[PDB]
């Protein structure tokens, strides 16, 4: 609908009442939100990122403890 709403918004007097997309009824605002929404490949590709984010966040936080000392050591060099 990204290329469909653009045509609709090019003429200010052609209302978009609603409709059903894949057995799901939407309003005009739902269509607008659906338009700004990414595709299946992008959304599913980011789905695995969020599910594995919990493990990734745990590893980053555990590895952050040695990095805290390095940042403080680098900060001291920045001071002097």
């Amino acid at each position: 609908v990204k290329e469909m709403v653009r045509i609709l918004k090019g003429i200010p007097f052609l209302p978009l009442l609603g409709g059903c997309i894949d057995d799901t009824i939407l309003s005009r605002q739902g269509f607008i939100n659906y338009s700004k929404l990414p595709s299946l490949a992008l959304v599913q590709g980011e789905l695995v990122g969020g599910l594995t984010f919990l493990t990734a966040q745990t590893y980053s936080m555990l590895q952050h403890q040695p990095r805290q000392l390095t940042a403080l050591l680098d900060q001291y060099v920045k001071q002097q």
Binding site: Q65, Q68, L69, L72
Partner: peptide, 26 residues
């Protein structure tokens, strides 16, 4: 310098947590 690295690695995370806290206060 090598002795300092060995001493740091020989401590637990609780001991370095207070070590970092004092260094953060500068």
């Amino acid at each position: 310098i090598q002795q300092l690295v060995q001493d740091i690695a020989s401590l637990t995370l609780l001991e370095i947590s207070d070590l970092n806290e004092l260094l953060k206060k500068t």
